Structures are given as C-alpha cells and as structure tokens.
C-alpha cells in the first residue's frame, strides 16, 4: 500500500469496500482503537522525564577559589546538553517505533483478509482483493468482522477462475 | 560568627582609577541565624556594617537578567524573555523561570510522532 | 468485479516530525513537547509584582547604593528583576564574594 487515503478520516487503517451496490471507505474499528490506545500511552509515558530533584545546590569561589561553583556549574551544564541530546534520541526512537507499528498493523490486516478469502479472490493492485464471486454488503461486513466463510462462495468463485483460466 | 569565623586581610594591589578611584572594595555577606553573635575585629581597610536586611516570608524567587517593563496581567509564568500561559511540557526560552513554568530544553524542536505518514494521492 | 481494497489515513497536516532514518517527515497527527511562545513584556505572576530593580544591580539594592534608594522598604516580591549591564549603579570599585551562592 504505497498510497494514502484521504476519504478515511474516521480511523487510520481502513478498507475500501466495493460491491455491485456501491463503493465506500470503512475503517477497521478494533485496529484503529487498539492502536490509538497504545500510541496515547506511549506519548504520556514518554512525557515522564523525572528531572533530578531540586537539591538546593549553589556554591561560588568565596574569594578563596572554591571551584565548587565551577564544578557545580559544569555539573548542571553537563547534565543538560547530555539529557537534552538523550531526550532528542528518545523522541526520534519513539517516532520510528510508532511509524513501523503503523506499517505492521497495515500488513496484519492484509494477512487477515488474505487468510479469510484464500483462493476465493485475486490479489491485484496495491492491496486490493478482486472477488471472483459477488461479496454482498453483509459478506463485506463478514470479511471485516472476521466472520467471512469461504465454503458458501467457494464453488461459484472456482468456476469463474476456470472460465478465465 | 557561629561558624563563619572569617579572619580576613586586605591586599594593597589594584588596576587603574575606576570611576576616579584606583583601589578596590570587595564586599561580603553572611546569612545570620537568630541569637547568634558576629565578632568583627579589624585595625584597617574595613568597611563596617551598620544596617542589614531581616529575612522574612522566605518564598520561591530568582534573579532575572533582562531589560523589560512590568505587565498588568496576572500571568502563571515569567521568563527573562517574556511570560508563558500554556501547558506544553518543555521550553526553549530560558532556564531561569518563576514557580509554574515548563522545564528547559536546548533543542530546536521536540515533536513526538502519533500518526501515519501523510501521503495524499 | 466485486473488490475490496486496503488503505491508510492521509490529511493535510504539514506537521514535520523527524526520525532516526529520515527528517522533516510529514505525519497525519503529532504531539509537540517544546514551545517558543513568550509575549516579550515581563508580566505579573500570581498577583505579586516583582522587584524590578531598574538599573541598580542586586548588590546595590542590598548594599544600599545612594542612587536607586527608592527600593528599600518595598513589600514582598514574587521575584527580582535585574537589568543586565547595570549602568546607573557602579556599586563603586569592588568584587562581591559568594555571589551566585
């Protein structure tokens, strides 16, 4: 699937059903909702940054070269620009993990529909299933709800293949 | 003092006349606890203390380094460069802040990705 | 023939989000953690005006510099504002100690 769908503004991952009756864009509810739950929890958990406690820390040379100041200075300046870099990495990290998580959900749904349909359809296009037989609106729901049944439409589909075979 | 028994010495050495005076005058301080004694003894080069600030209502504050006027707006926050009344977790403005104020990061942008790659048509 | 197609979401969010592999990647939805919004005029905090020390340095206010004497019995301040490069108060020739302390 190398092309995005603008019409699927309800959820991320969706199916474009096409029957003799018509064509629509139906999002998969469980995939989108579960993914949204996981992504949101990642976001809120990443926020936890738990900076070091405010240990009321400051010193200075005290006119006697008490570099505790330049030590404590570096220590705070060195904790930042290190944690900041480290945090930039964690953002970039989580960014990719969300992106590949998305690609994985795509491929999982495509395998779901392949497993149900099997040889009752042709894999054609960028993730499109051309039904040899006619999947009714209900039948389209059954594939979506995971309740599709191969045998009922099997024989009809088989004869159609043999016609073009 | 209680602990700061700071027996000091002047030093006869400076640079050119600053504002018409070549010599220097380093000043000092000490936070003093109640019922504590401050034994000052000197026989020269000493600028003795005659007035002092009684610390009262100790409360969170800081020392802001900027040249900006006063606002007529009770804003939940102040930073050397201005104020902030939002909720985003982190800042890039300035570490020095007042009470309620997001944390400070030196990054130019920190955006977490929560959606798909936006590829229209 | 009857067909079913698979697809992901796409909107018009120009939001750019960087990754380890790529940068300036436009995503459909994103969250921002940093922010650069500041008015520029130093306002108030919780209804508590600050000790805007105008020109006189913090040392001068403490050391009682004759110029800028107006700030002596000012009531409690939520914070203290010092202009950088204090010009009016030269605090005289001298080096304060344990300063940032």
């Amino acid at each position, epitope marked *: 699937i190398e092309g995005g769908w603008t019409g699927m*503004v*309800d*959820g*991320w991952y969706g199916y474009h059903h096409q029957n003799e009756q018509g064509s629509g864009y*139906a*999002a998969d*509810l469980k995939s*989108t*909702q579960n993914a*949204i*739950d996981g*992504i*949101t*929890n990642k*976001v*809120n*958990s990443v*926020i936890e940054k738990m900076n070091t406690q405010f240990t009321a820390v400051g010193k200075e040379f005290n006119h006697l070269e008490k570099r505790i100041e330049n030590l404590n200075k570096k220590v705070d300046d060195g904790f930042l620009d290190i944690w900041t870099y480290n945090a930039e990495l964690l953002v970039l990290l989580e960014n990719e993990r969300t992106l590949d998580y998305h690609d994985s959900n795509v491929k999982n749904l495509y395998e779901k529909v392949r497993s149900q349909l099997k040889n009752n359809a042709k894999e054609i296009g960028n993730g499109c299933f051309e039904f040899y037989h006619k999947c009714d609106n209900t039948c389209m729901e059954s594939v979506k709800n995971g309740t599709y049944d191969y045998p009922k439409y099997s024989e009809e589909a088989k004869l159609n293949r043999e016609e073009i075979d | 003092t209680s602990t700061l028994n700071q027996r000091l010495v002047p030093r006869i050495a400076t640079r050119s006349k600053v504002n018409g005076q070549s010599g220097r005058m380093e000043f000092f301080w000490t936070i003093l606890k109640p019922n504590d004694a401050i034994n000052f003894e000197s026989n020269g080069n000493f600028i003795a203390p005659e007035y002092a600030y009684k610390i009262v209502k100790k409360g969170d504050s800081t020392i802001m380094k900027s040249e900006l006027e006063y606002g007529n707006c009770n804003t*939940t926050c102040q930073t050397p460069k201005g104020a902030i*009344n*939002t*909720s*985003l*977790p982190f800042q890039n403005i300035h570490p020095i802040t007042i009470g*309620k104020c*997001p944390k400070y990061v030196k990054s130019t942008k920190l955006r977490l990705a*929560t*959606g798909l790659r936006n590829v229209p048509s | 023939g009857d067909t079913l197609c698979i697809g992901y*979401h796409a909107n018009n969010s120009t939001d750019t989000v960087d990754t380890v592999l790529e940068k300036n990647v436009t995503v*459909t*939805h*994103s*969250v*921002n953690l940093l922010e650069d919004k500041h008015n520029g005029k130093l306002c108030d905090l919780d209804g508590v005006k600050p000790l805007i020390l105008r020109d006189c340095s913090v040392a001068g206010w403490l050391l009682g510099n004759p110029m800028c004497d107006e700030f002596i019995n000012v009531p409690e301040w939520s914070y203290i504002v010092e202009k950088a490069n204090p010009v009016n108060d030269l605090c005289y020739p001298g080096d304060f100690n344990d300063y940032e302390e």
Partner: antibody
Amino acid sequence: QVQLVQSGAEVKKPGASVKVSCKASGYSFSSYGISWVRQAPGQGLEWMGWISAYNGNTNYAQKLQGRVTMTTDTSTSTAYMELRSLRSDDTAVFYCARDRPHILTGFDFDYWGQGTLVTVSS
Amino acid sequence: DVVMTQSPVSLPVTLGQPASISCRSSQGLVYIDGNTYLNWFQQRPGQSPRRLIYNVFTRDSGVPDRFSGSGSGTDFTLKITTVEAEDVGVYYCMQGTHWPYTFGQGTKLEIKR
C-alpha cells in the same frame, strides 16, 4: 443554535426496555457524534455511551454493555439510547451531549440536552 | 481505567474570593491530536450541565473571564476570580483521553460565609 431536545419523562417497572430520544437541530449535524450521560438522583455524573453518526462506532460503558443499545437516525438527526433490562438502581435522569465523531479527533460535549428522568420501580 | 480525584469537594466562598478546584488524574491526559482534554463543566442546580474551558486552556464563548482553566500535568485546576452568585453550583472534571470517560466526583460552591 443550541437545541438538544430530549424525550419525555418515562416511567417503567424493572425488567422492561426503555427508549430515550434526543432530537437535534439549530446546528450543523455534519456526522457529529452524540454521547449519553446519567445522573443518579442527586448523585454523580456517570457516562453511559457514545455513538458516531459518521459511523456505527458505539462505545458502551463496561459496567453496562449488554443492556445498553444505541442508535442514530441521520435522516432525522436523532439519537436513541435503549436499556433492555431495567433495575430499581437504574432509576435516574438521563442526559445527552454532542461529541466528535472521528475517534482520531477528540471529544466536544459542546451542547447538552434537557434531562429525561427515568423511574424504574414496581 | 481513569480516576479523576476532585480535591476540594466542599467549597464555601465569599463574593469576590478567587477560589480554585483541583482535578487530579491517574494517567496523563494528552491525546494523539496533540492537545490535552479537561473541558471543565458546571451544572448550576436545577439546570443542565454547561462547558467552560475547552481542552486545558480555552475559555468557552459564553464564559466569564473570571472562570479560568489551569494545570499542565495530571494536577489541573480551575480558578474563578470575583466568585459571583450564578457561579455557585456543582462542577466536574472532564473525561480522560482514555475511552473510559471519567467525570469524577463533584465540587459545590457557597455564596458567602
């Protein structure tokens, strides 16, 4: 503008189905969703469910999942909440509120309805 | 599941005494959209609930400037200056971004003292 008209007050016996209707207008009904809230007599506010007119995405509250059935008539822009099984404890007043339809988008109970109280005792 | 704890349930006030109502969540309340979601509500007794602050920092069209939603982390607050008389009533936190939507308990106001 703001017009979330709830149904009339309803009185039933335990174990009978109840049907509340919230008819909406005076404001664009662009698939905007509708959620239903319950306030026990002089007690807390408990969210019961949400339905997206854009889709059929119901989210009945775990506590009450089997009994509760929610519907939408886009043509009349009317939502419906139906509690199949009734209880004396369920006796309360029910409230409606608009919600955003897309799960991707957040929620907005911008408009609230007229409280349909429902009494359930033998 | 989400737990919205409302700290000051009982809140008597005197006219013109900015008072605050604190809502504390069990988990962070940010969402994929990007914005937090704690639209405060007010149900003036005898009337149906009303909305105040959209998200965490957005006053509603017909809301007095007195009402102000605040807070960034799990602990959010709502402070109304010049507490007036229609201001009295019950208030609830907003449902968490989690689909478990949680209004939490209520906070009641008094006219004077």
